[PDB]
Amino acid sequence: ATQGVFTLPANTRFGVTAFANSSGTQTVNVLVNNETAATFSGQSTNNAVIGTQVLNSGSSGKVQVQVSVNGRPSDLVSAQVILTNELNFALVGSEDGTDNDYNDAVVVINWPLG
Amino acid sequence: ATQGVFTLPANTRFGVTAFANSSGTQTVNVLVNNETAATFSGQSTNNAVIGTQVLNSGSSGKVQVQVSVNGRPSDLVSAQVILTNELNFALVGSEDGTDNDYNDAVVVINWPLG
Amino acid sequence: ATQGVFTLPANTRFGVTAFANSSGTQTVNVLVNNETAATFSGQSTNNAVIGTQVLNSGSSGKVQVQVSVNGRPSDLVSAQVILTNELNFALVGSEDGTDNDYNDAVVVINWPLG
Amino acid sequence: ATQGVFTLPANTRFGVTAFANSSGTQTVNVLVNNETAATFSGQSTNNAVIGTQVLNSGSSGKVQVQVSVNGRPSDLVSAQVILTNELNFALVGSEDGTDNDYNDAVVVINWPLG
Ligand SMILES: OC[C@@H]1O[C@@H](O)[C@@H](O)[C@H](O)[C@@H]1O
Ligand SMILES: OC[C@@H]1O[C@@H](O)[C@@H](O)[C@H](O)[C@@H]1O
Ligand SMILES: OC[C@@H]1O[C@@H](O)[C@@H](O)[C@H](O)[C@@H]1O
Ligand SMILES: OC[C@@H]1O[C@@H](O)[C@@H](O)[C@H](O)[C@@H]1O
Ligand SMILES: [Ca+2]
Ligand SMILES: [Ca+2]
Ligand SMILES: [Ca+2]
Ligand SMILES: [Ca+2]
Ligand SMILES: [Ca+2]
Ligand SMILES: [Ca+2]
Ligand SMILES: [Ca+2]
Ligand SMILES: [Ca+2]
Structure with missing residues (x-):
């Protein structure tokens, strides 16, 4: 399945x-x-x-x-989590090698801000 | 329910x-x-x-x-997410006011490293 | 924070x-x-x-x-997870006593269907 | 990445x-x-x-x-999520076709029980 793609709230x-x-x-x-x-x-x-x-x-x-x-390109794994119906995290792990720790680059997207 | 508490693998x-x-x-x-x-x-x-x-x-x-x-003390929300049975995120949001955006401090814990 | 409340797509x-x-x-x-x-x-x-x-x-x-x-009323804990930007799970645990296993009633909401 | 594989506590x-x-x-x-x-x-x-x-x-x-x-075999997507450091869900979606709804079989694993 596609990984690393997220639909965020617009704008x-x-x-x-x-x-x-x-x-x-x-x-x-x-x-x-x-x-x-x-x-x-x-x-x-x-x-x-x-x-x-x-x-x-x-x-x-x-x-x-x-x-x-x-x-x-590294192999990606991702998911989105929502806490209290409001606080969002979009999470990405990636593997560049053979050990499959999937932490070689880790990316966290968070919203809302402010 | 208690929030912001996580059991990691030892050491x-x-x-x-x-x-x-x-x-x-x-x-x-x-x-x-x-x-x-x-x-x-x-x-x-x-x-x-x-x-x-x-x-x-x-x-x-x-x-x-x-x-x-x-x-x-801020009110906390939290959860732990595991991707591909290997990459762990322990996630915390917190609320210091009335708007309940729960992003006032956001804390990301990740493992394994290295 | 409020738990057990989710906003789904309408209809x-x-x-x-x-x-x-x-x-x-x-x-x-x-x-x-x-x-x-x-x-x-x-x-x-x-x-x-x-x-x-x-x-x-x-x-x-x-x-x-x-x-x-x-x-x-039991005490609730909840979150929502989204896989491949498409498949949604809204998850609820509940505790009716003192042991805090939070599995006394477990509720899973999933969408889309069909 | 491997999907649909979970390490539970033993026994x-x-x-x-x-x-x-x-x-x-x-x-x-x-x-x-x-x-x-x-x-x-x-x-x-x-x-x-x-x-x-x-x-x-x-x-x-x-x-x-x-x-x-x-x-x-259907294409799988999965994650594990832990609430209040106690309640575990291991979640699987699967796609048997082309529409990529990933709900064709949905599998929920939960623990602990009792
Ligand atoms: O030297 C450290 C290593 O570097 C690369 O091989 C990574 O894929 C591996 O997970 C580890 O971080
Ligand atoms: O001024 C910005 C505001 O500050 C506090 O009131 C926060 O609780 C609120 O969410 C917002 O961030
Ligand atoms: O008898 C079994 C027990 O029943 C209730 O006390 C529950 O709160 C507890 O978690 C356990 O399931
Ligand atoms: O409408 C029935 C259809 O059956 C298969 O094609 C599924 O892959 C599709 O997602 C849908 O459920
Ligand atoms: Ca690696
Ligand atoms: Ca690494
Ligand atoms: Ca706030
Ligand atoms: Ca804020
Ligand atoms: Ca209980
Ligand atoms: Ca119980
Ligand atoms: Ca399908
Ligand atoms: Ca379907």
Whole structure:
């Protein structure tokens, strides 16, 4: 199934934050309505916050996360969770190798903000 | 129901990261085996990262997140989500006021690292 | 924070299923737009499906689960999960006593159907 | 990533319940320690419960859900979510066709019981 794609509330600010846990340099791309809106990169095996940004979900609300290492797309796993019918997290894990820890880049999207 | 309390695997490193979305200064305290292991403070209405750290869950694996604003305990919501039977997120929202957006401090705990 | 309340898409069929795990007879009420739309009762300590029903979320999409044991409301915990940006689960646990297993009545709401 | 595989605490009773939403007859196999422990089958486009059972997670705790329709495995999506650090849901959706509703067989595993 498709992973890393989320329908957010339209026209709404959200946070997107990426963590790295791999020997490989991660590159995380965040697309809003199919166009790159943010790119984060770094290399850490200790959960460094390689990027954090506030974006607007735009007219369609479509947000997609893509991860690559040295130009190779990582395999993604994702889900969205909603607490108290209001607080949202869209969660992404990714695997760049063979150990299947799925933490090589971890991406958390949160809304609402403010 | 109790919120913000998670049982991690014993002796395991985990990330903890806090974001703020409120007029009030947030104080986030992270307890491991009932003792304070990290404390973050800050104020933002734009999802600023007010702290990030790597901790070890110790022999008990018990991790607790508490949030207060000017000494007043915030009401918490929480859950844990596991993707592909491997990647764990323990998620906390908190409310310091009347609007019930539950994002006043948002805390993300993730493991495994590395 | 409020628990057991979910906003579904309007005029949408959903499934609701209740399980019991307690010495006490569980009564599960499912409200749509603040009116009872399904009720299930029973006693099991082995996860009996005390009822399952297909309901329509109607014009408001407001669905609320309430649980009681001989008139006494149980304490609720809930969340919603979305898989592949499409498949929705609204989850409820409840506690009727002191052990905090929160499985005394468990309720799962799922959509879309068909 | 692998989907439909969950590690439960060892030697723990769990419930498993399957629902159908498709023109096709669903076959759901539940493995414990890599051997079939339960098999459900049925056909419904209205979320009928096609099987429910209580099982033991056994010495390894490894539980796997497989779904087959019209002679081929369906594509699976899954996650585990834990409420109040106590109540566990392991959730599976599956797609037997092209519409990508992922509800064709829906499987809910819950623990602890009793
Ligand atoms: O050296 C650390 C390792 O780097 C890559 O191989 C990762 O895929 C692996 O999970 C681990 O983080
Ligand atoms: O000024 C911004 C506001 O600050 C506090 O009142 C918050 O509880 C509220 O959700 C909002 O963030
Ligand atoms: O007798 C079994 C017990 O019945 C009630 O006390 C429940 O609250 C408890 O969790 C347990 O299921
Ligand atoms: O309308 C019946 C249909 O049966 C199969 O095609 C399913 O894959 C589809 O989602 C739908 O349920
Ligand atoms: Ca890896
Ligand atoms: Ca890694
Ligand atoms: Ca607030
Ligand atoms: Ca706020
Ligand atoms: Ca109980
Ligand atoms: Ca019980
Ligand atoms: Ca389908
Ligand atoms: Ca279907």
